Design a protein around this ligand. Structure first.
Ligand SMILES: *[C@@H]1O[C@H](CO)[C@@H](O[C@@H]2O[C@H](CO)[C@@H](O[C@@H]3O[C@H](CO[C@H]4O[C@H](CO)[C@@H](O)[C@H](O[C@H]5O[C@H](CO)[C@@H](O)[C@H](O)[C@@H]5O[C@H]5O[C@H](CO)[C@@H](O)[C@H](O)[C@@H]5O)[C@@H]4O)[C@@H](O)[C@H](O[C@H]4O[C@H](CO)[C@@H](O)[C@H](O)[C@@H]4O[C@H]4O[C@H](CO)[C@@H](O)[C@H](O)[C@@H]4O)[C@@H]3O)[C@H](O)[C@H]2NC(C)=O)[C@H](O)[C@H]1NC(C)=O
Ligand SMILES: CC(=O)N1CCN(c2ccc3[nH]c(=O)n(CC(=O)NCc4ccc(Cl)c(Cl)c4)c(=O)c3c2)CC1
Ligand SMILES: [Ca+2]
Ligand SMILES: [Ca+2]
Ligand SMILES: [Cl-]
Ligand code: NA
Ligand code: NA
Ligand SMILES: [Zn+2]
Length: 805
C-alpha cells in the first residue's frame, strides 16, 4: 500500500528515491505504479509540444508548457532544445562542421566531463551504413568521434542480458540475467520482461556502473526509464539534471530507446516501416546535442551511442517444434524462441532423463534448424553455463529460425517478422558503438570489440576504479585520447625447472615400447644443443607463457618444439612450435606406429604410462606436437616422448589428427608460417576458469593421469603476411580454438564422412579469444614481443568469427 496522497511539487524526477508508503516522483515510479497523485500534472507536462516557434520567442513564462521559449529559460535549464536555433538565430549542432575537441571545454564548476550513455535497443550494426541518409546526427557523431564497424554483444543476444552486461562488464552467467525470461530453481520464481518480479534486486548480481559511481562519490542519473515517459521528456530531464548545482549534479547519465527494436520485431530489420523509427532516434540525438550546445556542454560531454544487439528476419513458419522429435513433450518446459532451454516440467522427478532428451534431438532431420547441447558442451566462447538459472539442456537455434514446444504455443499465444537472441557471432546480431567527446579520439575507426569491455572504459571516463569484471582493462585504451589506466603484465607466480638428463632408460617401468635403437660427433653436439634451447628462438616466438599460479613444472626443449611440462598433471600445460610456409608433412613410419619413449629428463614418478592406456578401453592418447610435422626423421623421435603425450578419446583423435596433419599445414601455407601453442584445459565445473587438481572428475583408468575437458590451440602469424611468422616486424594476427574433448562426435551431424567435410566446421564453432584460454589455463601469453602491451591486450581479446563481412 502506497499513500500516494503526497505531492511532487519541487520533486519532479528526484534523484534519490523515497521509501514507501510515501509516494514517489522519480523516473521509475510509474513502473511501481506509486507516483504521487499529481505526477502527471507536474512532471509530465506536454502543453504546446517540444519545439519553439517564432511566436513563442521571449514569451511570458507559462509553467504549464512542456518546455519554454521565454528569456529566463537558459538559466532555469528548461528551454526547448531548439530555443537557441529559433529564438536566437543559432544553428543546429548537426549543421556545424566538426572541430576536434582537444580538451574538455566545460563551464566553471564542472569537476570532470559528464558521461551520457545513449543506448538503442535492436540497433543492428549495418543500420549505420544502410540508414545513413536518414540519420545525420548519428552520422556526424560517428564520423567525428571514435567508432567501431560493429560491437559484439553477449549471448543470448537479448535485451536484458545485454544492457546489464553493458552496465557491469560481466558475462550474463556472472551477473545473473541470463535471459529475457528465466526461472530460478532456488527462488522457485520466474523473471520476465513484463511483470513485477524483475524489480526484485535478488536477480541482479555484479556491481553496475551507477553503484560503482555512487560508492566512489560520483553521482549517477537513473539508468532504467519507465516506458510511458516519452523520449522528449527523458532528454529534457537529462538536460535539467545537467543544470543542477555542482554538489547535486550527476556525472553519469543514461538515455534508453525502445526503438528500433520495437518496430524491428514487427517489420523485420529492413522493413520499409523501419525508416521512420530510424529518423525518430536520430531526431532525439539532435535534441540531446542541441540541448548540450545550448548549455555549452557540447564540447564538454562524452557521449556513448551504443546498442544492445541487432535484429534478424524471423517469421512463424520458420519454427521447429519439439513435438516433432519427442513423444513425451509434456514432461518438459521449454524457454522457447531464438534459443531453447529445456528442464523437467515437474521438478524433482526421477523419470526425467536429460540424456534421452538430447539423443531424441540430435541429428534427427537432415535440415534440422537447431542443435541440442548439455550446457557444459556449449562453445566456451559463449561463457553460458555457470549459473543455476541456465538449464542443463540448451538448444542453439539457427539464425532466422525459432524453436517452440508444440504448434499450439505459436498459434495460441503471424505476429512478427523480426527477432534476435541467436549466437553472438551472428552478423545480424552485431550492434553499434560510437564514442564522441573530449576523452575519445577524433575521427578514429577502431576494430570491432565485445560489449563486456565498455564498463572498464566508462569507469576510466569517470575516474572510477572498476569492480572486478570480465573486460580486459587496457584492451580498449586505443579508443581514448587520454588514458587513466596503464595496464601491466601479471607477475609470474611459478618459475620453471630446466631439467637435464637425470634418469637411465631402465629406471622406467611404463609398459611403453618403441622401435628406436638404430645406431658421429658432428650431429651429436648438434642434438645436445637442441635439448638445451638452440632452436628456441624459432619455436617460442613470443617468449614463454607465464604460469600465474603455484605449481611445479619443467621447460623441455627439442629440435621442433618447446614445452612446459607439469609434474602435477603429468602432461604439458603448453607446447609451442613454428611451422614455416616451406615445411613438409610426413607420415608416422609403420615401425613407429605405437612408439612411446621415456623422457630421461623427467622422473618415472612424474611421467604417464602406457599400461594405463592399454587398460582403459575408452581412452586412447595423442601428441601435442604432431609427429607429422617433424623436421627430419631423426627429430621425429622427439614427438613420441611420453612427455608430449595427452589422453584422447578415439572419437576426438579423428578431430585432432586432421587438425595436426592437414590444417596446421594449410594455415602455415595461407598465413606464411604459423606459430602454434597447444595444450589441455581442465574445466570440470564449467566456470571458465582453470581447475585445481582436486577438481578433476576423470582420470585415465587406474592412474593419476587427469583427463582434459578441452584442447586449445593458439595460432599466431604476422598481420603483414608478406613477412614470415618467424621474422615478423609488426602487429601479429591470431586465431584460436578450444575444442571440447568428447568421447563421441554427436555434435557434428556429418562426422561419418571424411574429416574434410566436418572437422573444420566444428573448430570454427569453437573459435576462442586468447584471453578465454588464459582464464581456463592460468597462463599468460605474448610476454616478449616488440608490440605495446595495450596492443597485445587487444590481440588477446580478438575472436576470429568466420562470418562474412
Ligand atoms: C568474470 O568476472 C567475474 C567477476 O570477477 C568472475 O566472477 C568471480 O569469480 C570469483 C572466483 O570464482 C568469485 O569469488 C568467489 O566469491 C565467493 C563469494 O561470493 C559472493 O560475494 C561476491 C563479492 O561481493 C559476489 O560478487 C557474489 O555474487 C554472486 O552470487 C550471487 C547469488 O548468490 C549473484 O547475485 C551474483 O550474480 C554472483 O553470482 C555468480 O557467482 C557465483 C560464485 O561466486 C556463482 O555461483 C553464480 O552462478 C554466478 O555466476 C557472491 O554473493 C567466495 O565465497 C569464494 O571463495 C571460496 O573459494 C576460495 C578459493 O580460493 C576460498 O579462498 C574461500 O575461502 C571460499 O572457499 C569457501 O567457500 C566455498 C564456496 O562456498 C566452499 O565450498 C569452501 O569449502 C570454502 O568454505 C570466491 O572468492 C566471485 O564471487 C565472482 N564474482 C562474480 C560477480 O561472479 C568470473 O570468474 C569471471 N569469468 C571468467 C570466465 O573469467
Ligand atoms: C538492479 C536494480 O537496481 N533494479 C531496481 C530497478 N529495477 C527496475 C524497476 C523498474 C523498471 N521499469 C522499466 O520500465 N524497465 C525497463 C527499462 O528501463 N529498460 C531499459 C534498461 C536500462 C538499463 C538497464 Cl541495465 C536495463 Cl537491463 C534495462 C526496467 O527494466 C525496470 C527495472 C530492476 C532492478
Ligand atoms: Ca534489446
Ligand atoms: Ca573450472
Ligand atoms: Cl531468454
Ligand atoms: Na585405451
Ligand atoms: Na556425428
Ligand atoms: Zn527485441
Amino acid at each position: 500500500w502506497t499513500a500516494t496522497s503526497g505531492s511532487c511539487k519541487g520533486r519532479c524526477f528526484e534523484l534519490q528515491e523515497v521509501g514507501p508508503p510515501d509516494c514517489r516522483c522519480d523516473n521509475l515510479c510509474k513502473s511501481y505504479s506509486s507516483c504521487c497523485h499529481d505526477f502527471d500534472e507536474l512532471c509530465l507536462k506536454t502543453a504546446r509540444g517540444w519545439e519553439c516557434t517564432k511566436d513563442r520567442c521571449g514569451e511570458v513564462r507559462n509553467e504549464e508548457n512542456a518546455c519554454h521559449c521565454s528569456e529566463d529559460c537558459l538559466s532555469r535549464g528548461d528551454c526547448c532544445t531548439n530555443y537557441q536555433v529559433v529564438c536566437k538565430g543559432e544553428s543546429h549542432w548537426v549543421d556545424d562542421d566538426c572541430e576536434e575537441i582537444k580538451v574538455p571545454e566545460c563551464p566553471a564548476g564542472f569537476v570532470r566531463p559528464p558521461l551520457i550513455i545513449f543506448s538503442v535497443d535492436g540497433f543492428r550494426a549495418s543500420y549505420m551504413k544502410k540508414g545513413s541518409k536518414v540519420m545525420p546526427n548519428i552520422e556526424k557523431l560517428r564520423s567525428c568521434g571514435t567508432h567501431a564497424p560493429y560491437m559484439r554483444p553477449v549471448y543470448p543476444t537479448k535485451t536484458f542480458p545485454n544492457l546489464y552486461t553493458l552496465a557491469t562488464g560481466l558475462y550474463p552467467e556472472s551477473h545473473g540475467i541470463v535471459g529475457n525470461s528465466m526461472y530460478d530453481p532456488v527462488f522457485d520464481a520466474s523473471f520476465h520482461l513484463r511483470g513485477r518480479e524483475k524489480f526484485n534486486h535478488r536477480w541482479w548480481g555484479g556491481q553496475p556502473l551507477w553503484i560503482t559511481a555512487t560508492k566512489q562519490g560520483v553521482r549517477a542519473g537513473t539508468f532504467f526509464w519507465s516506458v510511458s515517459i516519452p523520449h522528449e521528456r527523458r532528454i529534457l530531464t537529462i538536460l535539467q539534471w545537467l543544470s543542477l548545482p555542482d554538489n547535486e549534479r550527476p556525472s553519469v547519465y543514461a538515455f534508453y530507446s525502445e526503438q528500433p527494436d520495437f518496430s524491428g520485431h514487427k517489420y523485420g530489420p529492413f522493413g520499409p516501416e523501419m525508416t521512420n523509427p530510424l529518423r525518430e532516434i536520430d531526431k532525439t540525438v539532435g535534441q540531446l546535442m542541441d540541448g548540450l550546445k545550448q548549455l555549452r556542454l557540447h564540447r564538454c560531454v562524452n557521449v556513448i551511442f551504443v546498442g544492445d544487439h541487432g535484429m534478424e528476419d524471423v517469421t512463424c513458419d520458420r519454427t521447429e517444434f519439439l513435438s516433432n522429435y519427442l513423444t513425451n513433450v509434456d514432461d518438459i518446459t521449454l524457454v522457447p524462441g531464438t534459443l531453447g532451454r529445456i528442464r523437467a516440467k515437474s521438478i524433482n522427478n526421477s523419470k526425467y532423463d536429460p540424456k534421452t532428451i538430447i539423443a531424441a534431438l540430435t541429428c534427427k532431420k537432415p535440415d534440422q534448424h537447431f542443435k541440442p547441447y548439455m550446457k557444459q558442451h556449449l562453445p566456451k566462447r559463449l561463457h553460458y553455463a555457470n549459473n543455476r538459472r541456465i538449464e542443463d539442456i540448451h538448444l542453439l537455434v539457427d539464425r532466422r529460425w525459432h524453436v517452440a514446444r508444440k504448434p499450439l504455443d505459436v498459434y495460441k499465444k503471424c505476429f512478427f517478422q523480426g527477432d534476435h537472441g541467436f549466437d553472438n557471432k551472428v552478423n545480424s546480431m552485431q550492434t553499434v558503438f560510437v564514442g564522441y567527446g573530449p576523452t575519445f579520439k577524433y575521427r578514429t575507426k577502431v576494430p570491432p570489440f565485445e560489449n563486456i569491455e565498455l564498463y572498464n572504459v566508462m569507469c576510466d571516463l569517470l575516474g572510477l576504479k572498476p569492480a572486478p569484471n570480465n573486460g580486459t582493462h587496457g584492451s580498449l585504451n586505443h579508443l581514448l585520447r587520454t588514458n587513466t589506466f596503464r595496464p601491466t603484465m601479471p607477475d609470474e607466480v611459478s618459475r620453471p625447472n630446466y631439467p637435464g638428463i637425470m634418469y637411465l632408460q631402465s629406471e622406467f617401468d611404463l609398459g611403453c615400447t618403441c622401435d628406436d635403437k638404430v645406431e658421429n660427433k658432428l650431429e651429436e653436439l648438434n642434438k645436445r644443443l637442441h635439448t638445451k634451447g638452440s632452436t628456441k628462438e624459432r619455436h617460442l616466438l613470443y617468449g614463454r607463457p607465464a604460469v600465474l599460479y603455484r605449481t611445479s613444472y619443467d621447460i623441455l626443449y627439442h629440435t621442433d618444439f618447446e614445452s612446459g611440462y607439469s609434474e602435477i598433471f603429468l602432461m604439458p600445460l603448453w607446447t609451442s612450435y613454428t611451422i614455416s610456409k616451406q615445411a613438409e608433412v610426413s607420415s608416422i613410419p609403420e615401425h613407429l606406429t605405437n612408439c612411446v619413449r621415456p623422457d630421461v629428463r623427467v622422473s618415472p614418478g612424474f611421467s604417464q604410462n602406457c599400461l594405463a592406456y592399454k587398460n582403459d578401453k575408452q581412452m586412447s592418447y595423442g601428441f601435442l606436437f604432431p609427429p607429422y610435422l617433424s623436421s627430419s626423421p631423426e627429430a621425429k623421435y622427439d614427438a613420441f616422448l611420453v612427455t608430449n603425450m595427452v589422453p584422447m578419446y578415439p572419437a576426438f583423435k579423428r578431430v585432432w589428427a586432421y587438425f595436426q596433419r592437414v590444417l596446421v599445414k594449410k594455415y602455415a601455407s595461407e598465413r606464411n608460417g604459423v606459430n602454434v601453442i597447444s595444450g589441455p584445459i581442465f574445466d570440470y565445473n564449467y566456470d571458465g576458469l582453470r581447475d585445481t587438481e582436486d577438481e578433476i572428475k576423470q582420470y585415465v583408468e587406474g592412474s593419476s593421469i587427469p583427463v582434459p575437458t578441452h584442447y586449445y590451440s593458439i595460432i599466431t602469424s604476422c598481420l603483414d603476411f608478406t613477412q614470415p611468422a618467424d621474422k615478423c616486424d609488426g602487429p601479429l594476427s591470431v586465431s584460436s580454438f578450444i575444442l571440447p574433448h568428447r568421447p563421441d562426435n554427436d555434435e557434428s551431424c556429418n562426422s561419418s564422412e571424411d574429416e574434410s567435410k566436418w572437422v573444420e566446421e566444428l573448430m570454427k564453432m569453437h573459435t576462442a579469444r586468447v584471453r578465454d584460454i588464459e582464464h581456463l589455463t592460468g597462463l599468460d601469453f605474448y610476454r616478449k614481443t616488440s608490440r605495446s602491451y595495450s596492443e597485445i591486450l587487444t590481440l588477446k581479446t580478438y575472436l576470429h568469427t568466420y562470418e562474412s563481412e
